[PDB]
Amino acid sequence: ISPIFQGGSYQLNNKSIDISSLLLDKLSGESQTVVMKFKADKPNSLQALFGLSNSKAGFKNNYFSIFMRDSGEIGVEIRDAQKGINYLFSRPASLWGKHKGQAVENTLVFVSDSKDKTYTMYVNGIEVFSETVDTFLPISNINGIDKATLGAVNREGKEHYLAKGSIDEISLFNKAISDQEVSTIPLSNPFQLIFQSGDSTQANYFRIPTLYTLSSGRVLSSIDARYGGTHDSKSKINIATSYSDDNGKTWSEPIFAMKFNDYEEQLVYWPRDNKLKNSQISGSASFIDSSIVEDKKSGKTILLADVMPAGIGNNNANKADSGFKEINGHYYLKLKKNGDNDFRYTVRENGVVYNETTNKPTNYTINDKYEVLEGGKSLTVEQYSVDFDSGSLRERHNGKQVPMNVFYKDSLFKVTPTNYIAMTTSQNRGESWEQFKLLPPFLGEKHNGTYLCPGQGLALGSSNRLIFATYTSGELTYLISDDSGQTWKKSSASIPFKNATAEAQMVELRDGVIRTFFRTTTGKIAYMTSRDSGETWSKVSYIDGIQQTSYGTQVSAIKYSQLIDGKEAVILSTPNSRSGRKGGQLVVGLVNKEDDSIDWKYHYGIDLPSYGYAYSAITELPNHHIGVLFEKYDSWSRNELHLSNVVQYIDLEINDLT
């Protein structure tokens, strides 16, 4: 259909624009669509972009509005006091403000569907809410509507929710346009999605992005594909990957690098209400926090991630148990059999399950997928699915048999309920991944695994040394391999923090010199340096000039290949805020060749200081652009849980930053 109204280039400078004469008598029927292209790079705290209201005395609660907050939240109100209806639908972190210094043209589509009794909001090609109600209120059927307003809502003759911004285009339609038709509306997005709801992972949520440029020029990305909302483990989470062969312009359909099948891959709309938002998948195994590196020698890509057995996460993992038994200088994965009260078994060479009480092997073996075989035959368990049909989270058997895995709740043999690190490799630059292998324990029999630092491992330029940073209580624990990831050793570096989330990323400043940047609890990003390729580490210093919150956020970092202002340069990606995970920046530092100190010279605002920015990934693309994949929301805030399509990718050039 054609619009009933269409207008453009409206400047909203804290003064509403009346469009009543042009619009009100055009509205007819009970279904409507609003299409709006708008900019707001300096928004007020709470402002209305569009309003339909009864402006008369005594009817201040009779209006429809599309509003936004300076947090990036978008929403609508639909209110009629005579009908006893006060609808408020919204989602945090739905907007862009600025990109490369220029105000972003957001494309908003709001569909009010009387037939299906559903209100649906899209912003920038992303559905941010869809809500069905028992009693539908057509936005035009509000009792006594007499004003259509841009940049405010007229209540009792006064301008409420005054806006600062611009509406470059607005159209209204007397129809609820289909999802298919919405998808045809041209966008002006400053970003793209690599992973997204409805893709091959079937996860509705993503967290913890990585990026790594491979020697072929292919750019590889990994991510937590999170099924049970955005919650950390315990949950269902797989590790997914996607690559780009054209400098980040297009990305492959995702595949899994690490996956468990004890629970179904379900795309679920996780509740965001206060009563249910902490619902958590509690019986599934999961992977969490991935990191990637490329080995020059073998040509292989190596991916590590944490592994959690069924129902386990950081919260409840046994901190005093590695899950391995030492027998004669070697480490063997311990197992507990159905019925036993101890772990009386181990997994030895060739996967033979051994009885520790009797010291003889059993008729059970563990294969390369950590699946249980009996006499060479595959055992199975029944898979679970989750639903909220009952009004609360239910996890229940779905009739499907899958291979019995020792990380599963229903398995005959179960691993120690603690956290592990696994690695997988690819011989075809991320087109397929091998089955994962558990890394051995590094801190003894009675210490849980260290926690992988998400992002990149480091491939030293002048050797075949590979390093992955990890953390635990009181130290960074660097994992080092000189044989293409076949064997690893630890290098411990004390940090003055007990029990910190010291997520760390590394850059090679020059040959053999490594600087590690890491999250702390001090409000400042810290760093340390090695000058012997990771064997020994300096004391900890701190960066002034960047603020983080008391709890901190992951920082990503690369050494840029080109000189800037005649100097070697390092680029950091982090929120810059003492308040929340927002105010995302790339910070460019120039290296002082005399002492390897870094002068943090340029700060580039990724978007508004008030807009969300959490964990991030950065890479120098083969054309020397910078690719950034980041969580565009406050991933700490308990108001911003369970948002879809907030992990987004942008492309920047150095001149944009400087």
Swiss-Prot record:
Reaction catalysis annotation: Hydrolysis of alpha-(2->3)-, alpha-(2->6)-, alpha-(2->8)- glycosidic linkages of terminal sialic acid residues in oligosaccharides, glycoproteins, glycolipids, colominic acid and synthetic substrates
Renumbered ranges of BNR repeats: 242-253, 424-435, 479-490, 528-539
Keyword Repeat in annotation: yes
Entry binding sites for substrate: 207, 519, 581
Taxonomic superkingdom: Bacteria
GO cellular component, one term: intracellular membrane-bounded organelle
EC numbers: 3.2.1.18
Molecular function per GO: exo-alpha-sialidase activity
Keyword Nucleus: no
Active site per the UniProt annotation: 232, 503, 615
Protein family: Belongs to the glycosyl hydrolase 33 family.
Protein's name in the database: Sialidase B
